[PDB]
């Protein structure tokens, strides 16, 4: 939804954007759950400020 | 505050800034990490003087 948020608030849901870039750069299978475990870590974050 | 410190004596209450550069050139859960800690130890021993 654009513009559109809950109530007046500014509680924003707003997923988190990843490090480095291109969904082919890795196939590694690892170097990338590493980035998983950032990205929950990042999820908590974002999740108790509201 | 600008100067005006309580007393006199020698006090002065520490900013424990960081090494490295600004929010915006690390941006990682790993790097940032381990800065915190390092600023969390430096501010400890900070602290235990005076």
Request: glycine residues 6%; proline residues 0%.
């Amino acid at each position: 939804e654009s513009k559109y948020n809950e109530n007046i608030e500014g509680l924003g849901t707003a997923t988190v954007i990843e490090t480095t870039q291109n969904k082919a750069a890795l196939t590694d299978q690892v170097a990338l759950g590493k980035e998983i475990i950032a990205a929950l870590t990042k999820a908590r974050a974002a999740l108790t400020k509201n």
